[PDB]
Structures are given as structure tokens and as C-alpha cells.
């Protein structure tokens, strides 16, 4: 049976430390995202882009964090790629707070993040999504799934696999406490190619996996095998990163950010 | 490009 012992309370404090660090590193949390999407907040209501006219109005009235193609589909995709750059910085800052992580060979630290950030971005996009669309511009905007889908090939299909993932992932009803540990388990994957010292990465992952399992048992009385289900999702995420990477080939060879410039 | 961002973000 489960007991509240020194080992369990260490795993609870590890879970609490990752939660705290998660709140620090990602401004817009799932709790906040959900309050916006369900109209259960006093915060300013996001501008809905649902067609070409509301996008035109939206570009003006949703002031973005950077900024020029005549083509709407390309300008949307660009904003997405810029926000993904920002997301890498946030996820790296989070990685530094995982006990043992900054103690790994810097080269191994770079490899874990290099392969992980795309899996963590799709995880965190789900937090921002419902069946109708995705919160953008840290929640100033909402862009509908069908408006994204109406964009000319090959841009019309860029977000569809994220929405597919998100419909099934959000049905698990994870909260920010669950996701903080989930995201830390993904970063510490000992099977990324080109790692020097695997064993020290698996030792931290083993501790994170124990913490995740305890988190999901305490937090989710309704699904006794959520732990198993959540590991099956890490298996999925690989595939959607595969589809994303092969689509970034088509785009780059078929069509034409300030921190890359410096 | 990614490595570069991660590396400076790490230091
Ligand atoms: O700001 C955008 N695009 C520019 C634009 C939007 C409207 C009109 C004209 C330009 C944009 C678009 C889309 Cl589909 C998305 Cl998913 C995103 C994003 O927040 N992506 C995102 C969010 C959190 C973590 C990782 C990644 C950002």
C-alpha cells in the first residue's frame, strides 16, 4: 500500500520545486489559459481570428512581441516560429531548475533540450487549445482551428497534428502540477541520439518518473493507469515531431528572428 | 540555430 514516509515527502517536495520553477519560467499557465478559454477570468478577453477579415483587424489590435510577407499564411507561420524560439528559452530556463540537470556535461544538456523542446512545445500548446482553436500572443489572441486549416497548402496542415494531439491529451485533464513533472521526464530522456553519459540522465529520469507516478496517484483518483497513459503520450509526441520536421523540409525548400541575427 | 539559442540561454 502507499504510505506517507520520508521517500514520498521527498518526491512531493521535488514535485513542488518543479511546479514553482514551472510557474517562474512559463508566464501563461494551463490554469490561466483555461480561465481565459472558459470565460472564468476578470482578465481582458482575447481577440478571435476566425476568418480573413478578423485576421486583418487582429494583426493591428493584437500587438505581438516581434515583427514582412504580403502573404497572410506566411506571416502567421512566422509568428509561430518566433514564439517557438521564445519557448526554447523558457524551457531551457526550466531545465536549469531540474535537480542534477546543470550537473550533466553541457554537451549532454544541449542534446536533451535540442531533441526535447519540440515535444514540450506540443505539450504546452495543448494547454492553450480547446476544440475551437489556440490562444496566441500570450493570450491576447485566439485563432480558430478551422481558420488555420483554411490556409493555402502547405500551411493549412501545420497546426492540425497539434490539435489532434491536444483533443486526446486535454481529455486526461492534467493540471500545471502534473505537467511540470511530465515536462521534466521528457527533458531527461537517456535515448536522445549523441549523448555521452546516459546513466546519470536515467538516474534523474528514474527520480522524476517516481515523482510523476506519485503526483498522478494523489491528483487523479479517476484513472488508476494515468501514469502508463502519460508515458504512451511521450511515445506519440516523437511521431508528431517527425511529421513537423518533415513538413519544415517541404516549407523551407518550397517557400522563402532577432536572437539568431545577434 | 537551436543549439546556439540553447547554449547562450544555458550560460
Ligand atoms: O503569433 C502568431 N502568429 C503571427 C500572426 C498571428 C495573427 C496574425 C498575424 C500574424 C502565432 C500563430 C500561431 Cl498558429 C501560434 Cl500556434 C503561435 C504561438 O503562440 N505558438 C506557440 C505558443 C506557445 C508555445 C509555443 C508556440 C503564434
Task: Starting at the earlier edge strand, list the strands of the sheet with A47-49.
Answer: A47-49, A141-144, A133-136, A129-130
Would you say A87 and A121 are in contact if contact means Cβ atoms under 8 Å apart? yes
Rounded CA gap, A121 and A80, in Å? Answer: 11
* Distance between Cα A90 and ligand 1 center (Å): 16
Closest residue CA from atom 12 of ligand 1:
A80
In contact, A103 and A95? CB cutoff 8 Å:
no
Q: Tell me how far apart the alpha carbons of residues A95 and B9 are, in angstroms, rounded to a whole number.
A: 11
Contact A176, A22 (CB under 8 A): yes
Q: Are A100 and A202 in contact (CB under 8 A)?
A: no
* Contact assessment for residue A219 and residue A178, using Cβ atoms and an 8 Å cutoff: yes
The C-alpha atoms of residue A15 and residue A180 are separated, in whole angstroms, by 8
- Return the number of other C-beta atoms located less than 10 Å from residue A260's C-beta: 10
Q: Are the Cβ atoms of B9 and A93 closer than 8 angstroms?
A: yes
For residue A176, what are the contacts with CB-CB under 8 A and spacing of at least 6?
A19, A22, A23, A29, A30, A31
As a whole number of Å, the CA-based R_g of chain B is 5
Separation in Å, CA A63 to CA A54, A59, A241: 14, 7, 29
In angstroms, what is the span from residue A145 Cα to ligand 1's centroid? 12
**Peptide bond just before A154 cis, omega within 30 deg:** yes
Q: What stretches of A26-159 show up as alpha helix (H) in DSSP?
A: 30-37, 52-61, 72-96, 106-127, 145-149
Produce one character per residue of A206-242: b if its CB has 16 or more CB atoms within 10 Å, e if not.
ebbbbbbbbbbeeebeeeeebbeebeebeebbeebbe
- C-alpha distance from A51 to closest chain B C-alpha (Å): 33
Residue of A nearest to B10 (CA): A92
**Distance between B5 CA and the closest CA of chain A, angstroms:** 7
- Is A88–B6 a contact, with Cβ atoms under 8 angstroms apart? yes
The answer to whether the CB atoms of B9 and A85 lie below 8 A apart is: no
Q: Is A29 helix (H, G, I), strand (E, B) or coil?
A: coil
Q: Count each helix (H run) and each strand (E run) in chain A, helices first.
A: 11, 4
Any binding-site annotation on A244?
Answer: yes
What phi and psi values does residue A117 have, to the nearest 5 degrees?
A: -55, -40
Domain locations in chain A? 1-262
∠ CA A238-A239-A241 to the nearest 5 degrees?
65
A59 lines ligand 1 (CB under 6 A): yes
Mention every residue, 6+ apart, whose C-beta is less than 8 A from residue A252: none
Q: What is the resolution of this structure in A?
A: 2.2
CB contact under 8 A, B5 and A93: no
Q: Are A118 and A244 in contact (CB under 8 A)?
A: yes
Q: How far apart are CA A17 and CA A239, in angstroms?
A: 30
- Determination technique for this PDB entry? X-ray
Residue whose C-alpha cell is 514564439: A83
In this complex, is the C-beta atom of A193 within 8 Å of any C-beta atom belonging to chain B? Answer: no
- Nearest Cα residue to A101 out of A111, A90, A88, A86: A111
Residues with Cβ within 8 Å of A31's Cβ and at least 6 positions away in sequence, in order, are A175, A176
Amino acid at each position: 500500500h502507499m504510505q506517507l514516509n520520508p521517500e514520498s515527502a521527498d518526491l512531493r517536495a521535488l514535485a513542488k520545486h518543479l511546479y514553482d520553477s514551472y510557474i517562474k519560467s512559463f508566464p501563461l499557465t494551463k490554469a490561466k489559459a483555461r480561465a481565459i478559454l472558459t470565460g472564468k477570468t476578470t482578465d481582458k478577453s482575447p481577440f478571435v481570428i476566425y476568418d480573413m477579415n478578423s485576421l486583418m483587424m487582429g494583426e493591428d489590435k493584437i500587438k505581438f512581441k516581434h515583427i514582412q510577407s504580403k502573404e497572410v499564411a506566411i506571416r502567421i507561420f512566422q509568428g509561430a516560429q518566433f514564439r517557438s524560439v521564445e519557448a526554447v528559452q523558457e524551457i531551457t530556463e526550466y531545465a536549469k531548475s531540474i535537480p542534477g540537470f546543470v550537473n550533466l556535461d553541457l554537451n549532454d544538456q544541449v542534446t536533451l533540450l535540442k531533441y526535447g523542446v519540440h515535444e514540450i512545445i506540443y505539450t504546452m500548446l495543448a494547454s492553450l487549445m480547446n476544440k475551437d482553436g489556440v490562444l496566441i500572443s500570450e493570450g491576447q489572441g485566439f485563432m480558430t482551428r478551422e481558420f488555420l486549416k483554411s490556409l493555402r497548402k502547405p500551411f493549412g496542415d501545420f497546426m492540425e497534428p497539434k490539435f489532434e494531439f491536444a483533443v486526446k491529451f486535454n481529455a486526461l485533464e492534467l493540471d500545471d502540477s502534473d505537467l511540470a513533472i511530465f515536462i521534466a521526464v521528457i527533458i531527461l530522456s537517456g535515448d536522445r541520439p549523441g549523448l555521452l553519459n546516459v546513466k546519470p540522465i536515467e538516474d534523474i529520469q528514474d527520480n522524476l518518473l517516481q515523482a510523476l507516478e506519485l503526483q498522478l496517484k494523489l491528483n487523479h483518483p479517476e484513472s488508476s493507469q494515468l501514469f502508463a497513459k502519460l508515458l504512451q503520450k511521450m511515445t506519440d509526441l516523437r511521431q508528431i515531431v517527425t511529421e513537423h520536421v518533415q513538413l519544415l523540409q517541404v516549407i523551407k525548400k518550397t517557400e522563402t528572428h532577432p536572437l539568431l541575427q545577434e | 540555430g537551436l543549439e546556439a539559442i540553447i547554449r547562450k540561454a544555458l550560460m
